[PDB]
Design an enzyme around this catalytic site. Sequence first.
Site: not given
Lengths: 310, 310
Positions: A41, A271
């Site tokens: 991100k 994840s």
Amino acid sequence: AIYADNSYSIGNTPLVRLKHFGHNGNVVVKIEGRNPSYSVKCRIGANMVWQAEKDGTLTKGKEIVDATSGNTGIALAYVAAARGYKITLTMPETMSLERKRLLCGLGVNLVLTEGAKGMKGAIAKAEEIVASDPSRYVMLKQFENPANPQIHRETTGPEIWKDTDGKVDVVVAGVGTGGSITGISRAIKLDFGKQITSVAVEPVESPVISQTLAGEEVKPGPHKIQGIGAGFIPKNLDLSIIDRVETVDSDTALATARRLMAEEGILAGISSGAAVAAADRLAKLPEFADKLIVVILPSASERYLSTALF
Amino acid sequence: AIYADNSYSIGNTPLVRLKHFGHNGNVVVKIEGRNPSYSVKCRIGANMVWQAEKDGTLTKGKEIVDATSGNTGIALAYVAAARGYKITLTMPETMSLERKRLLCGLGVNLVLTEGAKGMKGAIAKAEEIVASDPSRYVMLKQFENPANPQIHRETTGPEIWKDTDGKVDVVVAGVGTGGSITGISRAIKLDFGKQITSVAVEPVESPVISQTLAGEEVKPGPHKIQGIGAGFIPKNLDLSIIDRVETVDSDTALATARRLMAEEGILAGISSGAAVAAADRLAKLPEFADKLIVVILPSASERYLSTALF
């Protein structure tokens, strides 16, 4: 050469071939933990700020305001520090002391909202702040801002193309905002013209993409796979370029991330385990035996020290 | 292209120009936190293992044994996992639970020694283990193994040369094992032939290099600058290529690392602050005004979450 600030240092992340997953080396991982602020991100923190500058919505003196429970807040915080913006992030008071300290350390004005309200409360408060002086504040909105998948079209996708010499056949990516699978897929399918298989990964506990595509009631649910499974179809998920959706459970995500650490020497987040577990399932199907499978690992594990991982 | 395991993904770390330090952009940092296992010691974990393989001291089935309080243990742990070696690391029982969990998670056999004995106790126990079956165990000895500065001569130094197009004038590096300043310096001075200024950084609290070079009593002392100031001249410090030694205090190291985070959006460790503080002193001397100063940041700060930093 020499980057003018740390926002420009995003990306060029490595591909590593997995030894204990897949079949004859068909699964390769892209380690987005190898980035400023430890996650994928950083690319969207950088580009959302960059695009807002180019479009004149972010200018000298204006303040970034956003509501962030995960890695995008860390990303926006380092970008705002590198580029010289004040930034206020809202988040529920329940957040970890360690995250708060990190964000405080990055220079963020932290506005803690009531614990009971969770993310709806923080998103509310951020919107409220922007309402209080819309000429002063800019909210960048990672779930809808096209600059999120755009950076993946310009960088993440082209890196996979180049590093595999065009041989990538399958991209496996968990979906939070959808930006990664959207941009990567648009790059490879549209700009490089290769009809790869794009695979969304979501939690079995909250399989809203699978339910949506099946015409079934959308029933979100809780799970532990941090960064994916937002419980809705975000605007930045282009369902048109998704070929297949794989669901993964939280326990197996974790167990897979632990195995990446112990067996491959790769320190990745939960994840990342979910993405690898989905990719390993595909990789052991004879239909995918001769296919090069590239799997996005969104984040690093030292950010998951105090979590079920460790 | 595609690395065969994560050991091969070391290096190619970015240079970022500092905005709030130096004078007209004369200080540039090399972010070794942007590496597997979050530090510069991924390069030596990889190469010490690689050299031991090439020289036949490390072979299939043999076990790595070493005594490690810092980042080299994390480095060796990920390399051993990536390459398929068992590894036993010794360290005092005083070590943090978080470090122990990380190492346990990387698959290490952790042997905790008595707290009172500190590092001498752990080094002892490692040596004792190797003594118990010297055909079975290999201790890699980062303070003396030439493969430590060799990897910096082959990789870190050439990266600085290439990314600055040969314009680097000054290298500033804190000294733990000495490998970084030794290899980098040998590369640039000997292999590229440029008479740069090589600057060792050590704590003012334990200025053993300065004392040594002055012909003074060597008086080590405690300090908080993790990763530097070992209290002796390591074999991997080539004093011949050191031009200047700068001393930095622990408080200013910390304060500098905090400023890197808040003002530059760079998340680096305490020793990174020490290196930058030394480099900033040099950078504000008129004798260094037209000179490009490259500063090594050894590690990232999310590894310093529970420390005086945060």
